[PDB]
Each structure stands twice: as C-alpha cells, then as structure tokens.
Design an enzyme around this catalytic site. Structure first.
Site: not given
Ligand SMILES: CCCCCCCCCCCCCC(=O)SCCNC(=O)CCNC(=O)[C@H](O)C(C)(C)COP(=O)(O)OP(=O)(O)OC[C@H]1O[C@@H](n2cnc3c(N)ncnc32)[C@H](O)[C@@H]1OP(=O)(O)O
Ligand SMILES: COc1cc([C@H]2SCC(=O)N2Cc2ccccn2)ccc1O
Length: 402
Positions: A4-5, A159-160, A402, A169-171
């Site tokens: 993704f990133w 993000l949750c 926050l 890959r839902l995130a």
């Molecule tokens: C122009 C405006 C832009 C707007 C958007 C700006 C960007 C915002 C970005 C978000 C800012 C959030 C700020 C906060 O809220 S940080 C707090 C995040 N929440 C938690 O940690 C709660 C507990 N965990 C979960 O709910 C899940 O494990 C989450 C949803 C975090 C991952 O879900 P899951 O574990 O089911 O994985 P997947 O298979 O769906 O997805 C895997 C992909 O996700 C990448 N990943 C993992 N953790 C994070 C993380 N914290 N930020 C960004 N990306 C993250 C990971 O490297 C991989 O990508 P890649 O390594 O393959 O490339």
C-alpha cells in the site's frame, strides 16, 4: 515492501526524508474535478456508511467498535476506551465535515466493521527554523518560505478495523476512500500519528507517565515497585497551589487564545485556533476535557488543560478500567512551567485519575524530572500525507493528538 504505502505520496525511506530541505507537496497537483465522485469500490457484502457523529446512537456504535477493536499496548494488557462524549467532542469541532467520518458496515446485518475519521485543522507546516537558516546561507530563502502560510488540512485519527477482519487489506481501502472525500473538499494534505513505524515520520517522541495511584498501577502491572513508600513518593497536595487557579469560563476564550497562540508560535509545526476552536477544544466538558486558568487581577496569565481517556484493563480481575489524564495545551507566562503542571497533577489526582500521560512534544521535557514523570514504552510518530517535511525534534511539535 509496503504494497500500500509504496503507492502513496509520502517519503518512502528514512534516507529520503534526511534529504528534504523545504516544506512542500509531493504528489502531482490536482483539482477537485480530477477526483472520482463515486466512492471507492468495496466488496458487495460491504457498504460505506457516514455515521452522524452528533447522533447518540451512531456515536454509540463507533464507541463499541473502538472499545473492542482499537489500539492496545504491545502486550495486550490495555486498550483505549474512548468515551462517547469524548468521540462527539473530538470528531465535531467547529466547521467539521460530516463526510470525513467514514465507516464500513456489513450490508446484510449492518454490523460496524471499520472506521477512520478526519477533522479540519489549520496547521503551520512551513519549512522549519533550522532549515530556513540553511536556505538563507544558500540564497534559497524564497523557496524555503513558499509554504509558510497556515494551511487548512485534514487531521486523521481513529482508524480501526474489527479484529475479525484484520490483515485483509481493508485498512488501505478505508485510507483511499477517506483520501477521496477529503480531496473532493479541495484539501490535499493530512497530518496523523501512529505508535507504529510507517513511511516516514517527520518527528517521533517518547511517551511519559506520572503515577497518581501507584497501588492500582502496580496491581494492574503497568508499574513495578514498600507500597507505603511508593505511595509516599508519588503523593500530591490535596489542593492546587497557584492562588486563583480556577476552571476556564467562556469569557476567558480571547485571552487563552492570545497566550496559546503566542506560545505555540515558537514551534515549527503547530495549530492555529479561532476563538470558536479555543472554546470547542478547551472549555471544560464533564468526563472529557478539564481546563484551568491562572487569573490574577482579572487577567488570564497562564492555563493548562488535560483530557480523559480511560483504558480497558484486559487481564486483571480487580480492575476493569484505568483512568488516564493526557496533558493537552497549556501556556505559562507568570510561573515556571513545572509549577503550573504541578497543579495539573493535583487536579487530576483529586478528580480520581490513576496516571497522567504525555508525549515529549511542546516543552513537556522541561518538567519531567521534577514532577516525577518516567519514560514509557510508547512512542508517537508524527506523519504528513502528501507533504515533504525535514526531520524535526518532537520538542518542535506543538500539535497535541487526541
Ligand atoms: C489528503 C488527505 C489524506 C487522508 C488520509 C491520510 C493518511 C491516513 C493514514 C492512516 C492514519 C491512521 C492514524 C491512526 O488512527 S493510528 C491508530 C490505528 N489503529 C489501531 O492501531 C487499532 C488496532 N488496529 C487496527 O485496527 C488494524 O490493525 C489497522 C486498521 C491499524 C490495520 O488494519 P489491518 O491490520 O487489518 O491491516 P490491513 O491488511 O487492513 O492493511 C495493511 C496495511 O495497513 C498499513 N497500516 C498498518 N497500520 C497502520 C496505521 N496505524 N496507519 C496507517 N497504515 C497502517 C500496513 O502497513 C499495511 O500497508 P502496507 O505496509 O502493506 O503498505
Ligand atoms: C503500556 O505503555 C503504554 C501504553 C500506551 C497506550 S496503548 C493502549 C493504551 O491503553 N495505552 C494507554 C495507557 C495504558 C496504561 C498506562 C498508561 N497509558 C501509551 C503509552 C505507553 O507507554
């Protein structure tokens, strides 16, 4: 790799971001018209939902998702338990955009499966001071100053993905759809923080913790150690020390704004608040935010604020919740900061909080030792989306997340 990133307009390595000398966008420049009007495709068994975050029942549904499925410590001993009233507060500041609050639900039973929220913030995010010095040396002042104006961007949090849907890959899809809604509002940057390391933070700070109820913190195995001596070490006055400390009232808003804005000014990255945003973010709300000013001779000369986030204690029998106070904004102009924050601690302790948490942003390091904060295992990494930014120290960050 990061499947993704790697596809996203962020710096990709530590290496890259040591190279960055000026603040500025990374992606191709775009227009609202370039942005799809249809939501991002998702599997037919799912649906996008925009909760109404001023509807008690929708706030409750988000609440439960986060209570069960949001951020834990590395040892699954604690999990944030953001309150409903807190969620309403954090997600509905003045001029918030309802469409920035993005959920996934199972189309069949409307079960809530995932969430991400954006809110507006006006952020100063021009080239930092140390790099403007270098630019001047090299006759590049104008390029360095090009993006000095405070920018209206998105702050993402919450993000949750539900435990049952992890590593599917839902995130990435939530992030793409959030990105799409924000872009359709003609906003092209975001700021977000995470405890995990992703590409690529512009700042990182340690967390710090001040014990207020050591008996409990030991019992839940947050702290270690005799309990009479540990209690004695952490003991606090029963009442605040600064004469004419009192809770903030609505008529304090303009002066609190003044002294806060003056202070946050001195940091490289920091928010700019209207009066409406000062009232929203700093006026006392029961169980949520607590703000006290020092007023002498009818003038507000200092203030501090903290907010409450309880955590579920996952393993213990005797306690199910930890009550934590987080240092929020403050400003001191008439007393040392440590004297001001001491009262924060007294107030927190008096109101029944177990621990006071902060990240080493702002001048938080200046009172660590004297007030007995200790470094924790947590780190908070700060990130921008679509914004090139030179590495800064966390004590040059003035944005409390926050
Ligand atoms: C122009 C405006 C832009 C707007 C958007 C700006 C960007 C915002 C970005 C978000 C800012 C959030 C700020 C906060 O809220 S940080 C707090 C995040 N929440 C938690 O940690 C709660 C507990 N965990 C979960 O709910 C899940 O494990 C989450 C949803 C975090 C991952 O879900 P899951 O574990 O089911 O994985 P997947 O298979 O769906 O997805 C895997 C992909 O996700 C990448 N990943 C993992 N953790 C994070 C993380 N914290 N930020 C960004 N990306 C993250 C990971 O490297 C991989 O990508 P890649 O390594 O393959 O490339
Ligand atoms: C256990 O160490 C930490 C945990 C946390 C977060 S992860 C999930 C949670 O509930 N934390 C808040 C917390 C838990 C226990 C004591 C203080 N803060 C932040 C910083 C830390 O040093």
């Amino acid at each position: 790799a990061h499947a993704f990133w790697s596809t996203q307009p962020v710096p990709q390595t530590e290496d890259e971001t040591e190279k960055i000398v000026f603040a500025g966008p990374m992606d191709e420049p775009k227009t609202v018209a370039d942005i799809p009007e249809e939501p991002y495709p998702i599997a037919s068994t799912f649906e996008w939902w925009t909760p109404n975050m001023e509807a008690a029942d929708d706030i409750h549904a988000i609440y439960e998702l986060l209570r069960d499925n949001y951020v834990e410590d590395d040892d699954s001993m604690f999990r944030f338990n953001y309150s409903e009233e807190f969620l309403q507060w954090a997600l509905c500041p003045p001029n918030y955009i309802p469409d920035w609050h993005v959920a996934v639900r199972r189309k069949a039973d409307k079960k809530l499966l995932a969430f991400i929220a954006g809110v507006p913030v006006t952020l100063r995010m021009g080239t930092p001071k140390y790099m403007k010095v270098k630019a001047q040396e090299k006759g590049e002042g104008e390029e360095a100053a090009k993006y000095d104006e405070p920018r209206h961007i998105c702050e993402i949090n919450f993000l949750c993905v539900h435990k049952q849907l992890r590593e599917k890959r839902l995130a990435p899809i939530l992030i793409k759809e959030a990105t799409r809604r924000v872009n359709r509002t003609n906003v092209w940057q975001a700021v977000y923080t995470a405890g995990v390391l992703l590409p690529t933070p512009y700042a990182s700070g340690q967390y710090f913790h001040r014990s207020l109820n050591p008996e409990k913190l030991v019992e839940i195995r947050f702290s270690g150690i005799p309990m009479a001596m540990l209690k004695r070490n952490y003991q606090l006055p029963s009442a605040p020390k600064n004469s004419g400390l009192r809770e903030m009232k609505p008529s304090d808003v303009p002066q609190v704004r003044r002294i806060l804005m003056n202070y946050l000014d001195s940091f490289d990255v920091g928010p700019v608040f209207s009066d409406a945003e000062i009232s929203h973010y700093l006026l006392p709300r029961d169980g949520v935010v607590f703000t006290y000013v020092v007023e002498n001779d009818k003038k507000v000369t200092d203030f501090f604020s903290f907010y409450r986030i309880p955590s579920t204690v996952i393993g213990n029998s005797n306690y199910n919740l930890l009550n934590a106070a987080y240092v929020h904004y403050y400003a001191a102009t008439s007393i040392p900061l440590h004297q001001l924050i001491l009262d924060l601690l007294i107030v927190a302790h008096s109101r029944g909080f177990d621990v006071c948490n902060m990240v080493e942003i702002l001048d938080n390091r200046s009172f660590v030792e004297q007030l007995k904060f200790g470094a924790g295992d947590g780190h908070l990494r700060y990130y921008f989306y679509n914004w090139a930014y030179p590495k800064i120290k966390p004590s040059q960050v003035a944005l409390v997340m926050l």
